[PDB]
């Protein structure tokens, strides 16, 4: 029993965190094999013009108490790739993957190439992440683990005026309509991840909470009209299929659980909580619920 | 900006997790130097758990009865002893990944990270608090016994908790790393129940100071309160009594935001009376009590 916001064990990623300094800017880098990846803003900016004026020795890379020597550099989208003389002996098995909004991942927040914390978060439908970062956190990374393979999906670049965060995949492509430049940028209107709230409702039933269940069902279309009224993401047939295992485990059909969600949106919780929360939680995917309620190890 | 329930990076602890098997029972162990620490109930059967005599069960065991696995390598047990509710297995290899560490016993209200493991393999990390009734609201399944709680301040790992059991309400009970249980709990399958839980007042105040630091002041009011009047109101909502030590501990946060501790207490009294009225504080509709004054300073201020 219990249901917590759980992050993946961070050890495989801790062994890759380095400090990258160029002039007056210091941020974090990801050292995998003989390459260090970091945000290109470490160097209205013209990044080809700023980079062409740099030599290899202008980049100071620190791995613990050891300086790494930069032997080459190149830019891929908004990520700077620093070729170093030493391959990281702690390099885990890894992939670079681009995630979709609604997907979750662990973030290892770092300052000066030193990991300070780990938390679980979700890519919001508006492509921002509600993270917890301070100045010097740039270059901190987001990941998932599957078996022994680390899939790197996020690199932190900036904070928006509302306190939320924006970054890229590990190939330097931003998530969302953002640019790596000090200019007026704002997060779009956010929406709730419907498939994730339903998954968390199934997790509450598995942990013995059934007060919100009702005898009713709904059509997908009628549910989608109601959910669009409450700034919830549209629920597709793919979402309904993905919730199949949880529906079969609890005996509550997805559209039956949707009718419970409609009643919660129209009437509230009435002084009650679900898994110790007075709000409907949307940062656990159907897979996170299955993994936590089964004990999958890495 | 932002405020998340943050756990410590778990790598230093992952390198210590091993699998311990005795007969049909398999659980997790903590391998530090040449010793593996694990719950002593690894020597029990299900027909033993009601009234186990651990000294009698242990005296019948030899070193080779304990199978210890570190990854894909079997460790050789060369000695064994019991310290309170922890079994200490001396092994023939010192852990090369042993970090700098301390064993610390924490007080209720203190927080820590838990690395949940199954079969000596880490599956997840989360942040938790020792509740006033000495239980933890964790996320544990069968086979997670031996999972540990820790804090990593500087490069030193302070081990404060080892998981032993789940109580009937779904909450968890365990020991410090010297085998002394937190609370009035025993490692027996006897009828045990957690005492009535209460809210950690000093932690809610710390989280209210964290909200002010992040730019949220809607909940503040023009009132102050005496410590006694605050405790007479707080006890009625099942909040822990706030002591002069708690008021002293909140000093730095009070000085940083300019809000006196007893003025923040008056705001807490009003929140308890009014509720939030559709508003949130740091993305939450409930008053959060699992961040200590120290966690707030660490996260909001670096
Ligand atoms: C051979 C021994 C043994 O398997 N012991 C573990 C046990 C336990 O609580 N386990 C579990 C821990 N954590 C989470 C759980 C979730 C779901 C089921 C079991 C969970 C089970 C029985 O009741 C007791 C009673 C006392 C003690 Cl110390 C331990 C236990
Ligand atoms: Cl303490």
Swiss-Prot record, chain A:
Chain positions of cross-link Glycyl lysine isopeptide (Lys-Gly) (interchain with G-Cter in ubiquitin): 5, 83
Catalytic activities: TSAVLQ-|-SGFRK-NH2 and SGVTFQ-|-GKFKK the two peptides corresponding to the two self-cleavage sites of the SARS 3C-like proteinase are the two most reactive peptide substrates. The enzyme exhibits a strong preference for substrates containing Gln at P1 position and Leu at P2 position
Cellular compartments annotated: Host cytoplasm; Host Golgi apparatus; Host nucleus
Cytoplasmic side: 1-298
Effect of residue 198 to V: In strain: Zeta/P.2
Activity regulation remarks: Inhibited by pyridone-containing alpha-ketoamides compounds 13a and 13b. In turn, alpha-ketoamide 13b (tert-butyl (1-((S)-1-(((S)-4-(benzylamino)-3,4-dioxo-1-((S)-2-oxopyrrolidin-3-yl)butan-2-yl)amino)-3-cyclopropyl-1-oxopropan-2-yl)-2-oxo-1,2-dihydropyridin-3-yl)carbamate) inhibits SARS-CoV-2 replication in human lung cells. Inhibited ex vivo by michael acceptor inhibitor N3. Inhibited ex vivo by compound 11a and 11b.
Active site positions: 41, 138
Coiled coil: none
Superkingdom: Viruses
Subunit architecture: 3CL-PRO exists as monomer and homodimer. Only the homodimer shows catalytic activity. Interacts with host FBXO22; this interaction promotes the proteasomal degradation of nsp5.
UniProt-recorded name of the protein: 3C-like proteinase nsp5
Top-level taxonomy: Viruses, Riboviria, Orthornavirae, Pisuviricota, Pisoniviricetes
